[PDB]
Design a protein around this nucleic acid. Sequence first.
DNA 1: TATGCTGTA
RNA 2: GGCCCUAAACAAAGGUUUAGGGGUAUUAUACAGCAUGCGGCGAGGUUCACAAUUUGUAUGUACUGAUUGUGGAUGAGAAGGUUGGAGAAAGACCACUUGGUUAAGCCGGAGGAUGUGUAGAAUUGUCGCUAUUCUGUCAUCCUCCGGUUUUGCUA
Length: 425
Amino acid sequence: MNNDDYPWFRKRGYLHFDEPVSLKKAVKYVSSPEKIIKHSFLPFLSFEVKSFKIKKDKSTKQLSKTEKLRPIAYSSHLDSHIYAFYAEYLTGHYELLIQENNLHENILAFRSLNKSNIEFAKRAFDTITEMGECSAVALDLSGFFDNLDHQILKHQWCKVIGTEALPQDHFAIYKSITRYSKVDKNRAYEILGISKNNPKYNRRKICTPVDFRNKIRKNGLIIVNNSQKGIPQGSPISALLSNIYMLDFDIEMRDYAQERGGHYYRYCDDMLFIVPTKYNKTLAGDVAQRIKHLKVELNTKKTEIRDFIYKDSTLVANMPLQYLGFIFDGSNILLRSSSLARYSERMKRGVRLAKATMDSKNRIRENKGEALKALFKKKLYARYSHIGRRNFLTYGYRAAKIMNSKAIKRQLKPLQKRLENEILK
DNA sequence: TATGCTGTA
RNA sequence: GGCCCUAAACAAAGGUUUAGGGGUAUUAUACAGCAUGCGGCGAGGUUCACAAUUUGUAUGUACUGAUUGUGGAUGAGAAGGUUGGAGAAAGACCACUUGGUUAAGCCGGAGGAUGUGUAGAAUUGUCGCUAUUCUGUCAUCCUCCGGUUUUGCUA
Ligand SMILES: Cc1cn([C@H]2C[C@H](O)[C@@H](COP(=O)(O)OP(=O)(O)OP(=O)(O)O)O2)c(=O)[nH]c1=O
Ligand SMILES: [K+]
Ligand SMILES: [Mg+2]
């Protein structure tokens, strides 16, 4: 066999309750609907990622620390092959329904369009530029993957496959993905005696099946989503189901924008409306009235309305507009500051770890009487400077090249001297 | 006595 | 205790409850970018343990200095700490380890000051082939306005 004929097959690298299968067994298993109906689905493994960001209180001029947690959940190997195979099945029907409704240019995320966020941001900013005096309204959903109603998702899934009810293997996958069960990874590693720091030492599965059935299940580690909403974040099929969920709302929003001479774009839960200025007040309530049929609700705290006028030749905004990592002021395109702050943090951490390792090995050379050596800089320049082939700066100069922006090049210019001064520190 | 791979969501 | 299979009871749901059994090696996702760029040269030794001799002495034995071989580790282009295990040793493996404290750091635009300038320059231990970046809307500093989440010190 050869992997090119089967594009859905990807070999997963993580530990789980099972261990990865070959291509030859996987193809023979997932292509039989009789196996899918009688499949014994394993629970997801779960963990949460910790993040801090700083906020300045405007009433006090004192800094505050805020916290955000994201529930990660990922499935076992054979279940991942089943989800990838049925995502490959559903993708063709969804892309036919895109072309039948002329939604090809409006729906952006999770589609194999051979384009990146730079081209989508360029399309949006060029649309604003071509339209002239207009208003851009940006919207967002609060907890998108955690609030998908199961019956609405079932109705959209039947509409995409073209039936009044799900067939048995499609219904089995629907039951597995909606009323999902999950096991916390750290509690499993505590109970099984697996080290949290080096879990892969001398094992291929997390545990034998009898240890699963006694230690994992009977100690109450399996938690079942008995609520009527949400899908897990990290399955191969979840992004496609999030696109299938929104389809009739995307048709209605395209009709709403096209009636008023406007445009509509959606990238996951990031909706952008570009409309004439007289519609800027009414739109934000009109979208919220229509979206309650899907039972997801708007994140009112993130909503931004920006108005564009000509300053005697130049289109200027009242405040700059952020979309997919770029900042648009009306004629100028800039990089979002969060990526530059992330780059500064990663660069300083990397140079500090390199200096720590340089201090580490020189103490060994001192003991043997060998002469000391200076800091090796090949890995430092490869990851944090323009000389390396794939880093943050290569993305920045690609963005400057595509969007024809000298302002992005002015942002990236002091980073070389900052890397050199961080090395010389 | 101090910790390990771009971009968007 | 979720999931699947078998059997039983109660009615008629894409059902509940009970009893028994099971989980197929050969640290997240989806699109996009890109395939720590590529190829030579460092390398003489050092350390640890055995083995054959001969060397300073005692009585086949006790050690012990040095040659000479066999094997483990190691210099090499930054994966940090603890003298905690294993070990003959290891810069390798196993175990624990992703803290605290800060109030400012970055991006853009206005007011100022301050220093002067079409081929050349910069980039890895080193060399060669590439590849990328900069070059008066010049560079540094101090107050405002808007955005953003990092910055310094210390284990
Ligand atoms: C950022 C991010 C998003 N996603 C998916 C899951 C999210 O439901 C979806 C959109 O996420 P976001 O809109 O980026 O964030 P959010 O919806 O969770 O809201 P908040 O920022 O307040 O937390 O994209 C990931 O799977 N991994 C990621 O790292
Ligand atoms: K080299
Ligand atoms: Mg959201």
